[PDB]
Amino acid sequence: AERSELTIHPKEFTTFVRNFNPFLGATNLHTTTDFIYEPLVVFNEMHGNTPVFRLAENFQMSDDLMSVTFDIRKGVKWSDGEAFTADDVVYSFNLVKEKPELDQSGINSWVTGVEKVNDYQVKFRLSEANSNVPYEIAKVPVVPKHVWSKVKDPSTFTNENPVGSGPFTVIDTFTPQLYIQCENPNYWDAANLDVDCLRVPQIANNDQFLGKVVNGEMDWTSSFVPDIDRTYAAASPKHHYWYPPAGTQAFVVNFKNPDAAKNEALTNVDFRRAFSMALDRQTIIDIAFYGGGTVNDFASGLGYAFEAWSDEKTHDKFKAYNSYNAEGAKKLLAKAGFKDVNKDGFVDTPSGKSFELLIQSPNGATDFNNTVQLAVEQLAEVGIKARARTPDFSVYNQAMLEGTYDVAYTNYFHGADPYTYWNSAYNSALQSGDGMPRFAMHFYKNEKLDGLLNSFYKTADKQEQLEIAHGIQQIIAQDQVTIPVLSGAYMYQYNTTRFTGWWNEENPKGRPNIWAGIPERLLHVLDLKP
Ligand SMILES: CC(=O)N[C@@H]1[C@@H](O)[C@H](O[C@@H]2O[C@H](CO)[C@@H](O)[C@H](O)[C@H]2NC(C)=O)[C@@H](CO)O[C@H]1O
Ligand SMILES: [Ca+2]
Ligand SMILES: [Ca+2]
Ligand SMILES: [Cl-]
Ligand SMILES: [Mg+2]
């Protein structure tokens, strides 16, 4: 007699440290959000951000877009039996407010205050008009007041025995190499859930992963798999995958690099364009990603997923700078004044200084690693000296947060409209803060651009959104702020050996991936049956 264990892989680790604190995204385990702490609403981003109501049953914006009310579902219990109510929501937002350390999404710059209207209704007051704020609100973890009010210091609290609202709150097994997370005994949506436990094995990199997945040892994964047909697909007809289109991937350059020679090059827009034209994006896609991507030749990073949003006069004006043109790259370096003056074949800065660009991508992310090595070779052909680095994710991340890096290859989260990409990638407000992610850390700062970003949802009118879009697109393309390469894919592999009900090509219910930060994975696990 065997419980239905579902084997998932949301995040690389070399060893598991027991940490289920949903506010500490950089050091916690990646089954905490959604699976332990259910959100108020899941927005189905693949289906136009259609709201799927979970712990909330409704929300409504005020007419001036300066406040919003959430109705809380009745009958819901924490895993320890205690009732879930508006108090828990109000508490959670007050906690993040007082301790900005715990704000990983930037909610503190939208919500000025939160109040309980009654036991199942919460009101949010805004600092500024935002018709999209319910989406932002839904990113904040909601935790139980009767536990966290008694917590010491939440920013170091490891929360080893979690009390949660989600489907899997019980820590059945924990070891450095394996943990098993089982059904919440008081789960409100238990009738809808047919999986008994989440089984989470320790896997450090894509190499260790490839061995395990081809051998049929996984159920639900979202890792890069090299040569997936001959390696994994051909291993069994039970081995399936579905890779729908995802977000932008780019080389991001540090505008505040402390080295004089490097700073001179990186902050030069002719240099960023020459760098960009040296890249053979299609070769990166074919070789490093085995076809799993689309060329991104928008200087703004927009991508072909959102070409309806594109001001095509802006896109075509700067398109040439974001296509493969090695002769053009060499000519631009020459015109700009990046001349090789010490006879080694690599261009030097206008002030005569030699330099090498260190390009980083995360350890274990072999598709990104191979991308950077291909770029290093393509750059050398036009006389730009570069070297690849593959630091551990925490080191990669910290070096961006601190501004010590030169160039970083990174992907971005992908929304229902271009705002998820553009805001996270360019809003200068997101360049400061301990909880802040890496995405905005080039430290290019443009007050006009921030102004446009912060006004994107001042109205409900989508035609005025589209025009703000066009303004944003123009600013970023004009300055070639990053070097966009491709639009990636939501890599997703599923095994029909032990479970059915999977999302796929024929059943495209939403983003199918198992990563933290994909709230839809809650809704996906609810569709699975043994
Ligand atoms: C936007 C973002 O940061 N996404 C992260 C994912 O990219 C990442 O998944 C990893 O992506 C690598 C690059 O394509 C893959 O090589 C790697 O196999 C994959 N790892 C896993 C476990 O799926 C995840 C996890 O590191 O974090 C996301 O936030
Ligand atoms: Ca179900
Ligand atoms: Ca030289
Ligand atoms: Cl563009
Ligand atoms: Mg059930």
Residue numbers in the entry: -1 to 528
Please quote the paper that reports this structure.
VhCBP is a periplasmic chitooligosaccharide-binding protein mainly responsible for translocation of the chitooligosaccharide (GlcNAc)2 across the double membranes of marine bacteria. The chitooligosaccharide-specific SBP is localized to the periplasmic compartment of the bacterial cell wall and serves as a mobile component of the (GlcNAc)2-specific ABC transporter. SBPs share a common structural feature comprising two domains connected by a flexible hinge region. VcCBP and VhCBP belong to cluster C/subcluster IV (C-IV), members of which are specific for oligosaccharides, including mannooligosaccharides, cellooligosaccharides, and chitooligosaccharides.
Compared with the WT VhCBP, W363A not only eliminated the CH-π stacking interaction with the nonreducing end GlcNAc but also slightly shifted the Trp513 side chain and the bound (GlcNAc)2. These shifts may have altered the interaction of GlcNAc with amino acid side chains from the upper domain, including Trp513. As demonstrated from the crystal structure of W363A, the Trp513 side chain is shifted by the mutation of Trp363 by 0.6 Å, and the bound (GlcNAc)2 also shifted slightly. These rearrangements probably affect the binding interactions provided by amino acids in the upper domain, including Glu10, Asn204, Ser221, and Trp513. The mutational effects of Trp363 and Trp513 on ΔG° were similar (ΔΔG° = +4.7 ± 0.4 and +4.2 ± 0.3 kcal mol−1, respectively), but the effects of mutations on enthalpy/entropy contributions are significantly different between the two Trp mutants. The W363A mutation had a large effect on the enthalpic term, while in W513A, a large change was observed in the entropic contribution. Trp363 interacts purely through CH-π stacking, while Trp513 interacts through both CH-π stacking and hydrogen bonding with the N-acetyl group of the GlcNAc in site 1. Mutation of three conserved residues (Trp363, Asp365, and Trp513) to Ala resulted in drastic decreases in the binding affinity toward the preferred substrate (GlcNAc)2, indicating their significant contributions to sugar binding.
